[PDB]
Write a protein that binds this ligand. Structure first.
Ligand SMILES: [Zn+2]
Lengths: 39, 179, 48, 172
């Protein structure tokens, strides 16, 4: 909504720091699968 | 878990604010923990109680229950997480930077690194010539003491562990009991 | 934000300020985004 | 004006006077007629005095009469100003919700009370600066240590999970 995205399975606002940490955890090979070359 | 409750009392004074610790003391008694009952015992405003509860929800100290009456019990597992973050801080504090004596004239306040020193050196003068002005680049000394800071930071961080060692040992004994 | 976070605020103000920081950084890169209202320094002038 | 006798608010003033003499420290049992003589309202008229006893005194919700003489409506408890440390000793009652507003009128000025509170083990925590006052003891166990909040500040993960798992892997 406007500037913030909320996830409902309890619609908690998403955390950019949390999303950044998940992105670091995400494997390079799966990142290539979704169309982003890792390097 | 009477020993765990005693350990919880020590940690709430050490980490939580005095207003939060009094609310946590109400949580320690599990015979009755209604949101209304907790509010009356605290004597705080409902909005003030809600703000304390929101901090506890982020801490994971309290778990929401449906009865509507809300029942609060001690589910905090971040006491170890906070202690480990402090341990990471101790490792970060000891691991600062090296000597890297930076030649810098305080007149022009320009920190030229030991690598930049060869450019500063002039053969005719025979001394590291301050390129920005006309003086001689002086040693950083007290200024920018990264090497001095790491030892002092490590010593201060090391002092914290013995005071918390008894609480950490009690937490370790509880972890051994949990298996 | 850094000084208030270092002091340790209640975080109710921190939640409002971080959204304002997000608005400021987003406004600089894009002004055509839906929402994100244009900021005028003076004389009804749109930012670029 | 519903039901009123003579000057408006006379009944409420009589209850306020009963509280005031107790705060003054001069305590005496007073009949309604005796209170009227003390407040110079003795010539309130026979009908007005009868109305106060029959309806106005009964109307007050918290009014308490021990027997022959009425007692102050606002505070049933005596303002002893003593055994506060015993109230602090039981944290279950949180000092029975003691308020500094009740104190400072019992027998001592605020300036004396502020010096006494700092010297005494008893400490006061006020969530609202003037609206409410509470008494608590944190003991000497709590430790400021070094950068205690700053270590918490490093842990800004909060809701995000598995951060502890990374620390556990480093610990291994
Ligand atoms: Zn210079």
């Amino acid at each position: 909504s406007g500037l913030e995205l909320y996830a409902e399975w309890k619609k908690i606002l998403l955390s950019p720091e949390r999303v950044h940490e998940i992105f670091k955890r995400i494997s390079d090979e799966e990142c290539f699968v979704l169309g982003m070359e890792p390097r | 878990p009477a020993a765990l409750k005693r350990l919880a009392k020590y940690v709430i004074r050490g980490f939580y604010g005095i207003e939060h610790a009094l609310a946590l003391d109400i949580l320690i008694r599990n015979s009755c923990v209604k949101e209304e009952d907790m509010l009356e015992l605290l004597k705080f405003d409902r909005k003030q109680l809600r703000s304390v509860l929101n901090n506890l929800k982020g801490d994971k100290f309290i778990k929401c229950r449906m009865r509507y009456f809300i029942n609060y019990r001690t589910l905090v597992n971040v006491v170890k997480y906070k202690l480990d973050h402090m341990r990471r801080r101790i490792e970060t504090d000891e691991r600062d930077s090296t000597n890297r004596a930076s030649f810098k004239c305080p007149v022009c306040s320009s920190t030229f690194t030991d690598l930049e020193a060869n450019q500063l050196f002039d053969p005719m003068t025979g001394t590291f010539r301050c390129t920005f002005c006309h003086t001689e680049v002086e040693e950083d000394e007290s200024a920018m003491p990264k090497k001095d800071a790491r030892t002092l930071l490590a010593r201060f961080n090391e002092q914290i562990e013995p005071i918390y060692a008894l609480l950490r040992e009690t937490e370790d004994v509880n972890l051994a009991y949990e298996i | 934000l850094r000084r208030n976070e270092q002091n340790g605020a209640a975080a109710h103000v921190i939640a409002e300020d971080v959204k304002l920081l997000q608005f400021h950084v987003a406004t600089m890169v894009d002004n055509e985004l839906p929402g994100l209202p244009r900021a005028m320094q003076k004389s009804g002038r749109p930012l670029k | 004006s519903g039901s009123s006798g003579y000057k408006f608010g006379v009944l409420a003033k009589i209850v306020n006077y009963m509280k005031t003499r107790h705060q003054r420290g001069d305590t005496h049992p007073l009949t309604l007629d005796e209170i009227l003589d003390e407040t110079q309202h003795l010539d309130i008229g026979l009908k007005q005095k009868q109305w106060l006893m029959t309806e106005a005194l009964v109307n007050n919700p918290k009014i308490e009469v021990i027997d022959g003489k009425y007692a102050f409506k606002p505070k049933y408890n005596v303002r002893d100003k003593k055994a506060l440390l015993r109230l602090l000793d039981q944290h279950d009652q949180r000092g029975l919700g003691g308020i500094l507003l009740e104190d400072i009128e019992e027998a001592l000025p605020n300036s004396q009370k502020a010096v006494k509170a700092l010297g005494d083990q008893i400490l006061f925590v006020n969530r609202p600066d003037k609206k409410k006052i509470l008494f608590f003891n944190d003991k000497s166990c709590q430790f400021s240590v070094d950068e205690e909040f700053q270590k918490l500040w490093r842990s800004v993960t909060v809701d995000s999970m598995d951060e502890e798992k990374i620390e556990e892997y480093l610990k291994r």
